[PDB]
Amino acid sequence: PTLRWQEDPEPEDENLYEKNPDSHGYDKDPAVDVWNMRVVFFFGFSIVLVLGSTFVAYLPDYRMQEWARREAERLVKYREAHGLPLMESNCFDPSKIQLPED
């Protein structure tokens, strides 16, 4: 014989269609919804996505990659011309060592 409440039946469902069939995602203000569609496709795709594609498609030599390609080509031709085998092992100088004796 008591209620513990005073409020409306929750919720009050409002369909976002059926007042604007020409509406996009949010509220029935017909101008700013078109403004949102325009800004999300122009300032979100048309100036961001394809420009980012052209930006990341080519840029300087990332991790000095093709620099290392041409450097390795010149170094292999250099070491083939000077008779020594390519990739001299023991990259640090074996004369430049001070071993702990035993």
């Binding site: 430049k96 060592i97 001070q98 702990p100």
Partner: protein, 119 residues
């Protein structure tokens, strides 16, 4: 750490704090203090139900001025304290060369460190 001329009373800023260069105009820490003063005036306008960002501008001007002033004095004290700590440290290094010898800097051609690989 302790005074270091507590003899020589508390002395909120000594006269040797004029020998160091002062904190300059538009230094970033006092600028942050001024931003905090503006936010303090804004939240003062937000406690009572007056409209925010308006109708309190003399209080804004007073709060920002007072906080920038106090922060300037605190920055001067901070600079003096760090400078006198550095002077005491280097004078104690100069006073006792025996206690703190320098390392014999053996080069990496003769530093033996074992390897312990990861697989």
């Amino acid at each position: 750490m302790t005074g270091r001329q507590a003899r020589a009373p508390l002395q909120f800023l000594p006269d040797e704090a004029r020998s160091l260069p002062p904190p300059k105009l538009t230094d970033p820490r006092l600028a942050y203090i001024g931003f905090l003063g503006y936010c303090s005036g804004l939240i003062d306008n937000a406690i009572r139900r007056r409209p925010v960002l308006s109708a309190g501008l003399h209080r804004q001007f007073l709060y920002i001025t007072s906080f920038v002033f106090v922060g300037y004095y605190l920055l001067k004290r901070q600079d003096y304290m760090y400078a006198v700590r550095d002077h005491d440290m280097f004078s104690y290094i100069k006073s006792h060369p025996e206690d703190f010898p320098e390392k014999d800097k053996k080069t990496y051609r003769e530093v033996f460190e074992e390897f312990h690989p990861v697989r």
